[PDB]
Amino acid sequence: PLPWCPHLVAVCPIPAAGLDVTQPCGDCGTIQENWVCLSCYQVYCGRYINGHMLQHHGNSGHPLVLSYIDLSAWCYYCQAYVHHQALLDVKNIAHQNKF
Ligand SMILES: COc1ccccc1CNC(=O)Cn1c(CCC(=O)O)nc2c(Cl)cccc2c1=O
Ligand SMILES: [Zn+2]
Ligand SMILES: [Zn+2]
Ligand SMILES: [Zn+2]
C-alpha cells in the first residue's frame, strides 16, 4: 500500500460507539463485502456486490474506506490502498471487534 496520501486529513475519530464489522450495507442490507467510510462511519457494500460504497463516495466525496473483510484502507481518489499511523486506531478497533 501507499505509506501516505493527501486524503488522510479526512479520516475522522472513531465513534466511541465503536465499529461493528458485521453491520449491513446501509442501502441494500447485504452482509457481504461491506466497507466503512472513515469520514462519517456509514457502512456500504463493495463494487462486486451492489457498489453502494462507490455511490456514497460519488455523492459525498469522502475519500477513504476500510474493508470489513481484511481491514485494508482504499482511497477512491488515489485509486490505491493506503496504510499510515493515522489508520492504526480504526484498524486495531476493527480487528478487536472482528477477531
Ligand atoms: C480488501 O480488498 C477487497 C475486499 C473486499 C472486496 C474486494 C476487495 C478487493 N479490493 C477492492 O475492491 C479495492 N477497490 C475498491 C474498494 C471500494 C469498493 O469496492 O467500492 N474500489 C475500486 C474501484 Cl471503485 C475501482 C477500481 C479498483 C477498486 C479497488 O480495487
Ligand atoms: Zn449495498
Ligand atoms: Zn462517508
Ligand atoms: Zn488519497
Side-chain angles (χ1 to χ4, degrees), residues 1-84 86-88 90-99:
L2 299 173
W4 185 88
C5 95
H7 308 99
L8 292 171
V9 294
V11 176
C12 296
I14 296 123
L19 297 172
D20 178 359
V21 306
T22 65
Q23 182 169 338
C25 180
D27 283 347
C28 72
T30 185
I31 56 148
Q32 307 185 54
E33 298 212 340
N34 291 307
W35 297 76
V36 58
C37 186
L38 295 188
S39 296
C40 71
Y41 291 89
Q42 288 167 21
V43 172
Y44 295 107
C45 64
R47 61 197 177 109
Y48 294 125
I49 313 298
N50 291 315
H52 291 131
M53 186 58 83
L54 174 56
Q55 178 187 303
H56 172 72
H57 165 69
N59 75 37
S60 76
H62 297 158
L64 278 151
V65 296
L66 175 76
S67 172
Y68 279 163
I69 302 316
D70 77 337
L71 310 187
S72 69
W74 180 259
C75 182
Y76 283 107
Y77 290 102
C78 298
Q79 316 166 254
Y81 298 100
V82 184
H83 182 69
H84 182 279
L87 299 182
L88 274 170
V90 71
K91 290 189 176 190
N92 290 336
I93 286 157
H95 185 277
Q96 284 166 18
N97 188 258
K98 194 163 176 85
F99 302 102

